[PDB]
From a paper:
NvfI from Aspergillus novofumigatus IBT 16806 is an endoperoxidase that catalyzes the formation of fumigatonoid A in the biosynthesis of novofumigatonin. Our biosynthetic analysis of novofumigatonin revealed that the Fe(II)/α-KG-dependent enzyme NvfI accepts asnovolin A (2) as a substrate and introduces three oxygen atoms, including an endoperoxide bridge and C-3’-hydroxyl group, to generate fumigatonoid A.12 Sequence and phylogenetic analyses of the NvfI homologs and characterized Fe(II)/α-KG-dependent enzymes in secondary metabolite biosynthesis indicated that NvfI shares low sequence similarity (10–15% amino acid identity) and belongs to a different clade from FtmOx1. The active site of NvfI is located in the DSBH core and an Fe is coordinated by the His135-His137-Asp250 triad, which is conserved in α-KG-dependent oxygenases. Further, the crystallographic analysis reveals significant conformational changes of two loops upon substrate binding, which suggests a dynamic movement of active site during the catalytic cycle.
Phe127 and Trp199 in loops I and II, which undergo dramatic conformational changes, may function as gatekeeping residues to load the substrate into the active site. The substitution of Phe127 and Trp199 with Ala completely abolished the enzyme activity, while the E208A variant increased the activity to 144%. Furthermore, the substitution of Phe127 with Ile and Trp199 with Phe dramatically reduced the endoperoxide-forming activity, while also forming 4 and a product with m/z 461 (total activities were 6.7 and 25%, respectively). The product was determined to be the C-13-aldehyde 5, which is generated via two rounds of two-electron oxidation of 2. We solved the ternary complex structure of the NvfI W199F variant with 2 and NOG at 2.3 Å. Although the overall structure is almost identical to that of the wild type enzyme (rmsd value of 0.8 Å for Cα-atom), a comparison of the two structures revealed that the space around the carboxyl ester of D-ring and the active site entrance is significantly increased due to the substitution of the large indole ring to a smaller benzene ring.
Author numbering: 1 to 278
Write the structure that this text describes.
Amino acid sequence: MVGSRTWCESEMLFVQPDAGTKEELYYRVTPKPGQTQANFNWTPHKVRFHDARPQRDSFDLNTHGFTFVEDAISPQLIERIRADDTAAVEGDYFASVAALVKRVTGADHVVCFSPYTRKENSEKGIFGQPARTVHCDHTPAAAIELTHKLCGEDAVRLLQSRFRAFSVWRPLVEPVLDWPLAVVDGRTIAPDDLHPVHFLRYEKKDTEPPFQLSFSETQKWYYLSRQRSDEVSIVKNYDSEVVPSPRSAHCAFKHPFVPKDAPPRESIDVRCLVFGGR
Ligand SMILES: COC(=O)[C@@H]1C(=O)C(C)=C2O[C@@]3(C[C@]2(C)[C@H]1C)[C@@H](C)CC[C@H]1C(C)(C)OC(=O)CC[C@@]13C
Ligand SMILES: O=C(O)CNC(=O)C(=O)O
Ligand SMILES: [Fe+3]
């Protein structure tokens, strides 16, 4: 893996370009003996990750599908989130995330859900660990289903205004050196790059499935080098409005120029239902 002044090379796990062209893809989170766990495989592919820091303030959610915003929070809230304080996450941090999205987008309503505190080499399952496969958190069907599930009677009225789904990512230890969150220019995503994958649990059908991405040389991947706890990444998973980037995609990668004995990456990401705004 080589690198330069504003980019480096690594790899991420992609699905095949023809994945799901014969049957629906599924991945059993709780695999049981006798039943097939998955009908597809991820494969690593070389990717050039361009450093976003030289042009950090120039990426916006409409043109690229992601943005980086300065937002400082108290070190006490960080240590509480690091201590698995569920009350601090669903209370103070949810209010912090909603206020940050409101002042960035001017939106009317923000609904937080599905918090994921991650640690490198953790044991809190897969979702307490950095993501290794390139994904978009919600398909359009998943984003609409989540609105009806979390907003209920107000879903139809809210879906008449602009609806967006965000992943609000923030590191808990700084700076992020290893396993950073890469993001792709949404304008460089082809429709053939998106593959719905149903994550199964005890045979329950996944009505909120994500997109899994296949590699493409056209994809321009970015990452904010040495990201700090005061720099928040907002990655767009869905957008009802037709913009140059209807969505983005994200994944973590092994940085090739970081010492092996570096402290493990720690972060928390929260999904957002965003209504209105610009
Ligand atoms: C390697 O990267 C990953 O495995 C991703 C990941 O880390 C997580 C945490 C996920 O959460 C998903 C799918 C992803 C994006 C996976 C693909 C599933 C598995 C649980 C929660 C749901 C939910 C909130 C109900 O919304 C849905 O639309 C269905 C898909 C998500 C967003
Ligand atoms: O933090 C990671 O490694 C992966 N994060 C996400 O998938 C997210 O924020 O939605
Ligand atoms: Fe994600």
